Amino acid sequence: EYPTVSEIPVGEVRLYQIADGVWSHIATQSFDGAVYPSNGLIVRDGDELLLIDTAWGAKNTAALLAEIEKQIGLPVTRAVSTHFHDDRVGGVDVLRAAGVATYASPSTRRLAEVEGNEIPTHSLEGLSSSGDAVRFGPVELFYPGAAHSTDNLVVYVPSASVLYGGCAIYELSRTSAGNVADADLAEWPTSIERIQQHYPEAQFVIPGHGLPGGLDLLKHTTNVVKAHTNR
Ligand SMILES: O=P(O)(O)Cc1ccccc1-n1cc(-c2ccccc2)nn1
Ligand SMILES: [Zn+2]
Numbered sequence: 001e002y003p004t005v006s007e008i009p010v011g012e013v014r015l016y017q018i019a020d021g022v023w024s025h026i027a028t029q030s031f032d033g034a035v036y037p038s039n040g041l042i043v044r045d046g047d048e049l050l051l052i053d054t055a056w057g058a059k060n061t062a063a064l065l066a067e068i069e070k071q072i073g074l075p076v077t078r079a080v081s082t083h084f085h086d087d088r089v090g091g092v093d094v095l096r097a098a099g100v101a102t103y104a105s106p107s108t109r110r111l112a113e114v115e116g117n118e119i120p121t122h123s124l125e126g127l128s129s130s131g132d133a134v135r136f137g138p139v140e141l142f143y144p145g146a147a148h149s150t151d152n153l154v155v156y157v158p159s160a161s162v163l164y165g166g167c168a169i170y171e172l173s174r175t176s177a178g179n180v181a182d183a184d185l186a187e188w189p190t191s192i193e194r195i196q197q198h199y200p201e202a203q204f205v206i207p208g209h210g211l212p213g214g215l216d217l218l219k220h221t222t223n224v225v226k227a228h229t230n231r
C-alpha cells in the first residue's frame with residue numbers, strides 16, 4: 001500500500017510502482033512546524049527514466065536518486081518541474097550536478113527566479129496558453145490554466161492511464177486550501193475542468209501531496225477550493 005507521512009522520516013524517500021515503468025516517489029518535509037508528504041513521478045523511457053518533480057529539497061532529492069539507483073537501476077536523464085515552488089524545483093541543482101537535464105516552462109523558470117528558487121535549465125515551449133498540451137517522451141504535459149499557481153502543469157502517462165495532477169489536485173484527506181499566496185482561486189475550478197475534459201480516461205490520479213485516487217480527486221479539489229473562496 002501507498003507510503004504515508006508517518007512512515008517516512010525526513011530525508012528518506014520511498015518509491016511506489018503504479019504500473020509497468022511508472023512509479024511515484026514520496027518524500028516528507030517540515031513546513032512551519034508540521035510534517036507533510038510530497039509526491040513526484042518516475043516514468044521509464046526505453047532504458048532511461050523521466051523524473052517528474054524534485055523530492056522537495058536537495059537532501060531529499062539526493063536520496064531520491066539513491067533510491068532510484070537502488071530500486072530501479074536505470075539512469076535518470078531528464079526531469080520536469082511542474083511549478084516554481086520548492087517542492088518541485090528544490091533539488092534541481094542536485095539533479096543538474098548528477099548530469100540530469102532539467103526542464104520547466106518559461107513561466108516556471110521566470111517565477112522561480114523572482115522567488116529565489118532553483119531554476120531548471122531547459123525551457124518547455126508550447127505550454128503558455130490554457131489548454132496547451134505537448135508530448136515529452138513517454139508523457140504528455142498539459143497546462144490547464146492557473147490553479148495552485150499560475151504556472152502549474154499536469155502530467156499524463158498514456159501507456160498507463162496515470163494522471164499526475166501535481167499540487168493543483170488535492171488528496172481526499174485534505175479538506176482545506178492552506179497557503180494560497182500564489183494560487184488563482186477564481187480560475188482554479190475552471191482549470192480543473194479543463195483537466196477533466198482533456199483526460200477523462202485517466203484511471204489513477206496522483207495529487208501533489210498524499211494518497212492517490214481516481215478522477216474523483218478533481219471534484220474533491222473543486223469542492224475544497226470553492227469552499228475556501230466562500231469566507
Ligand atoms: O502548497 P502545497 O499544497 O504545494 C504544500 C506546501 C508546500 C510548501 C510549503 C508549505 C505547504 N503547505 C502545506 C499547507 C497545509 C495543507 C493542509 C493543511 C494545513 C496546511 N499549507 N502550505
Ligand atoms: Zn506550490
Ligand SMILES: [Zn+2]
Nearest residue numbers: 087167208209
Ligand atoms: Zn505542493
